[PDB]
Write a protein that binds this ligand. Structure first.
Ligand code: HEM
Length: 154
C-alpha cells in the first residue's frame, strides 16, 4: 500500500504536536495499552510487576522507555514509506528477542490512535485519523513481512 503526500502531511502534522511532549505521550500510550490489554504487560520483564496506573505513572524507567519507543516510531513515520533500513533491527529484536505477535502491534496502534484522538481532536479529525491508521497499517504490514523472512510467524 502507498499513502499520498496529502496523507503523509496529515500524519506528520499531528506528530509534530506529539513531539512537543514525547515523554507525556509515551506514558499515556503505554498506560492505555497495559490497561486495555493486560496480557501485553507480561511481555516486559522490567515492568510486569506494576500493579496500578499510579505505579505506572510514577515509573521513571517506563517513561524513559516510552520516549525510546516513540522516537523510533517517529523516525519511521518521517521516512514516509522509505523505512526499510529502520525496520530491519526493529523487526529482528521484536521477533527474535521479545517475541511480539502482530496482534500486539495492532493493540499498541489502537492505543496510539486513542491517545491522539483524546489529546489532539482539532488535528485528529476523521481524515487525519484515517491517514494515521493507514500509516500504522503500512508499518504493521512491512513488519509482518520481515517477521516471515526472519522465521517468526507470530
Ligand atoms: C509501535 C511499535 C513499536 C515500536 C516502534 C517499538 C520500539 C521499541 C524500541 C525502539 C525498543 C528498544 C530497542 C529494541 O529492543 O529493539 C523496544 C523494546 C521493547 N519492545 Fe517494542 N516497540 C513497539 C511495539 C512493541 C509491542 C506492542 C510490544 C509488546 C507488548 C513491545 C515489546 C518490547 C519489549 C519487551 C522491549 C524490551 C523492553 C526492555 O526490556 O527494555 N514493543 N521497542
Amino acid at each position: 500500500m502507498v499513502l499520498s503526500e496529502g496523507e503523509w502531511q496529515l500524519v506528520l502534522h499531528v506528530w509534530a504536536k506529539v513531539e512537543a511532549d514525547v515523554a507525556g505521550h509515551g506514558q499515556d500510550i503505554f498506560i492505555r495499552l497495559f490497561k486495555s490489554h493486560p496480557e501485553t504487560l507480561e511481555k516486559f520483564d522490567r515492568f510486569k510487576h506494576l500493579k496500578t496506573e499510579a505505579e505506572m505513572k510514577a515509573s521513571e524507567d517506563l517513561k524513559k522507555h516510552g520516549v525510546t519507543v516513540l522516537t523510533a516510531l517517529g523516525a519511521i513515520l518521517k521516512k514516509k514509506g522509505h523505512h526499510e533500513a529502520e525496520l530491519k533491527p526493529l523487526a529482528q529484536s521484536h521477533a527474535t528477542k521479545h517475541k511480539i505477535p502482530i496482534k500486539y502491534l495492532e493493540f499498541i496502534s489502537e492505543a496510539i490512535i486513542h491517545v491522539l484522538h483524546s489529546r489532539h481532536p482539532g488535528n485528529f479529525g476523521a481524515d487525519a485519523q484515517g491517514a494515521m491508521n493507514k500509516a500504522l497499517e503500512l508499518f504493521r504490514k512491512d513488519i509482518a513481512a520481515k517477521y516471515k523472512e526472519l522465521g517468526y510467524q507470530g
